[PDB]
Amino acid sequence: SGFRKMAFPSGKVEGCMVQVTCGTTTLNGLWLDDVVYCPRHVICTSEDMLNPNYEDLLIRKSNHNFLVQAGNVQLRVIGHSMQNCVLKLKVDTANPKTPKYKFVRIQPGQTFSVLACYNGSPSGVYQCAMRPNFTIKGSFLNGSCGSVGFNIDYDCVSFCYMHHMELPTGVHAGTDLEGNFYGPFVDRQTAQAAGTDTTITVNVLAWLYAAVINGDRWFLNRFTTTLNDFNLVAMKYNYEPLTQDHVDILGPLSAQTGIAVLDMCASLKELLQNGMNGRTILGSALLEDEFTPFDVVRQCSGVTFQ
Amino acid sequence: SGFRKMAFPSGKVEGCMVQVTCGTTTLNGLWLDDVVYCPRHVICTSEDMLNPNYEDLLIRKSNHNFLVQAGNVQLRVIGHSMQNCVLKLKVDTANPKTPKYKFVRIQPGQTFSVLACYNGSPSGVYQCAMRPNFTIKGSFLNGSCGSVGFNIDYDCVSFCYMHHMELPTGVHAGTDLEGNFYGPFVDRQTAQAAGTDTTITVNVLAWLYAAVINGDRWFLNRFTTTLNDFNLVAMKYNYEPLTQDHVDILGPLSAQTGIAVLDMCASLKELLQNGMNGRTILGSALLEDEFTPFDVVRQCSGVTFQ
Numbered sequence: 001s002g003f004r005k006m007a008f009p010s011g012k013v014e015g016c017m018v019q020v021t022c023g024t025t026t027l028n029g030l031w032l033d034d035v036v037y038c039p040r041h042v043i044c045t046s047e048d049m050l051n052p053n054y055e056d057l058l059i060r061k062s063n064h065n066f067l068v069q070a071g072n073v074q075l076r077v078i079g080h081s082m083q084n085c086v087l088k089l090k091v092d093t094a095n096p097k098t099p100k101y102k103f104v105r106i107q108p109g110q111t112f113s114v115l116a117c118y119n120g121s122p123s124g125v126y127q128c129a130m131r132p133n134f135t136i137k138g139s140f141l142n143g144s145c146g147s148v149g150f151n152i153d154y155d156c157v158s159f160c161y162m163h164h165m166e167l168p169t170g171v172h173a174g175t176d177l178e179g180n181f182y183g184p185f186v187d188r189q190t191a192q193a194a195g196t197d198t199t200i201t202v203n204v205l206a207w208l209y210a211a212v213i214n215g216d217r218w219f220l221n222r223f224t225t226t227l228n229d230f231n232l233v234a235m236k237y238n239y240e241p242l243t244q245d246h247v248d249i250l251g252p253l254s255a256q257t258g259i260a261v262l263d264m265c266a267s268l269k270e271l272l273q274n275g276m277n278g279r280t281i282l283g284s285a286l287l288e289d290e291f292t293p294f295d296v297v298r299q300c301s302g303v304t305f306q
Numbered sequence: 307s308g309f310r311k312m313a314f315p316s317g318k319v320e321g322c323m324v325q326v327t328c329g330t331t332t333l334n335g336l337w338l339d340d341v342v343y344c345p346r347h348v349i350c351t352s353e354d355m356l357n358p359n360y361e362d363l364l365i366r367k368s369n370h371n372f373l374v375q376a377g378n379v380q381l382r383v384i385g386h387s388m389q390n391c392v393l394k395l396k397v398d399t400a401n402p403k404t405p406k407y408k409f410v411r412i413q414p415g416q417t418f419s420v421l422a423c424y425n426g427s428p429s430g431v432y433q434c435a436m437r438p439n440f441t442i443k444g445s446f447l448n449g450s451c452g453s454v455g456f457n458i459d460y461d462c463v464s465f466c467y468m469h470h471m472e473l474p475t476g477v478h479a480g481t482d483l484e485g486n487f488y489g490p491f492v493d494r495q496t497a498q499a500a501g502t503d504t505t506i507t508v509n510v511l512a513w514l515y516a517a518v519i520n521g522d523r524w525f526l527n528r529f530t531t532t533l534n535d536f537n538l539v540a541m542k543y544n545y546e547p548l549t550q551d552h553v554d555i556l557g558p559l560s561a562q563t564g565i566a567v568l569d570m571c572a573s574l575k576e577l578l579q580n581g582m583n584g585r586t587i588l589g590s591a592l593l594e595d596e597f598t599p600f601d602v603v604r605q606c607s608g609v610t611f612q
């Protein structure tokens with residue numbers, strides 16, 4: 001019993017974190033086999049970041065200018081290339097701690113764990129979600145760039161995020177491990193603002209199921225609804241529209257609890273319309289949307305790794 | 307920027323988790339040097355747990371009855387002893403992955419990370435606090451017993467909790483690594499109920515400082531208060547009394563922000579008296595008390611490990 005915002009165990013990623021220094025700048029890189037991945041803005045100075053021409057700035061760089069350090073041990077850089085917004089530094093030693101791994105580009109609403117690092121050193125782990133506006137709400141200070149987001153399935157780390165930028169509103173933007181930004185964001189210090197931070201409806205529903213499984217059930221009501229009626233209310237509250245795909249993925253939690261997906265939607269509708277009146281659900285006073293259906297099953301089941 | 311419920315990186319503990327089986331029962335143990343620590347109720351059956359005589363049940367056990375497995379590899383048990391509510395199984399191989407470590411008994415209000423495990427395998431990590439009633443609000447299913455709580459300071463893991471019991475109210479109870487329970491709880495399936503879950507006032511204040519550091523400042527007001535006046539309100543809201551020790555430990559956050567501890571107390575007082583009126587602080591609709599002052603400094607600073 002109990003339901004917690006839970007990150008994946010981070011050891012497998014911890015063994016891949018290194019420090020990358022180019023000139024005056026130091027951030028984190030990810031060492032997988034004989035390649036180190038990091039944000040290409042390592043090559044920029046603070047001034048460069050208003051309008052960088054990365055291809056021109058890169059001309060001035062040679063392998064020996066990228067200082068890569070794994071713990072107290074220096075790695076030899078034998079090649080480098082730019083792929084979209086990441087650098088790939090080829091080193092002469094394969095990381096002996098490389099886990100099984102994959103690079104995934106996730107969809108908005110999907111959750112992942114972040115290992116926050118500074119100077120190649122892990123500082124903490126927490127769970128995040130790719131918001132529908134393609135930001136994440138993280139905890140990143142100067143030097144955390146190159147920290148990564150990831151999921152683990154049995155013994156295989158699926159890397160999905162690399163941290164690059166803090167927007168002036170305090171939210172965060174980054175890339176997949178091929179270096180393509182999530183959303184419209186760019187690695188320049190310019191006027192970029194996040195769109196509407198809509199609520200991830202399927203995740204709220206999943207979390208409500210989690211609550212019922214754990215004895216928080218005061219919000220269950222006598223009502224039901226339809227997809228179209230529920231979405232009229234969702235839209236009004238800046239909730240993502242619920243689709244039949246979404247209903248289907250809630251099927252297993254529906255089956256375990258005996259509460260039809262649309263009956264749960266009617267509970268959510270009343271919560272949106274009447275608030276919580278000072279009550280709590282799973283220790284929260286607002287409706288949590290950073291747990292996916294798979295997350296809820298996983299944690300309510302006890303699936304483990306490696 | 308950003309402030310998140312953050313656990314310590316878990317790799318160092320992950321390398322210490324093993325599976326312990328005695329008879330029909332399997333839970334987790336902690337392998338440090340040549341000793342494996344686990345809950346002594348591994349030796350009980352489900353029936354035994356109404357009124358176990360551990361000393362008598364142990365007479366029937368020999369080294370070869372405790373099956374200890376590290377990944378796919380069996381460890382040889384060459385001795386065993388009971389220390390309060392934990393077993394210490396001596397094995398013939400020292401864990402090559404033993405980190406630097408200490409056993410600490412923590413005080414209520416102190417926070418720590420938990421690595422939830424099943425069958426010796428890590429499933430997830432999350433941050434917890436030792437409640438003032440000596441429970442923790444965790445996420446533990448059957449087979450998670452022997453999962454541990456810990457803090458990390460530079461390269462040294464301070465183990466402070468081992469998980470043992472779920473109370474009928476869904477909260478959790480456990481021991482330090484010498485096997486003494488936190489609080490009045492016992493390892494028997496009996497009528498034990500948690501006392502009042504009071505709110506950890508110094509932690510709420512710390513978190514409010516964290517909020518100001520990150521731009522959430524709507525709750526700052528024109529008022530101040532005194533320790534005695536604030537505690538009259540704290541008591542009414544089942545908040546722990548604030549002491550001068552507490553004020554002193556908030557000193558550094560006071561200095562960084564320029565907000566006197568007692569002025570912040572006056573903000574907290576108004577929040578307690580008038581609620582939040584549908585607003586949020588650091589993404590929460592209630593007052594978070596599972597971040598210590600040290601936690602807030604740590605995360606707002608970027609301290610790293612090993």
Ligand SMILES: Clc1cccc(Cl)c1N=C1NCCN1
Pocket residue numbers: 032033034093094095096097098
């Ligand atoms: Cl397995 C592999 C794939 C691609 C490149 C290298 Cl160098 C590889 N070799 C190692 N990676 C981890 C230790 N050896």
Ligand SMILES: Clc1cccc(Cl)c1N=C1NCCN1
Pocket residue numbers: 338339340399400401402403404
């Ligand atoms: Cl360092 C120590 C302290 C106590 C007992 C043993 Cl067996 C020790 N040896 C090792 N622990 C980790 C690897 N070797």
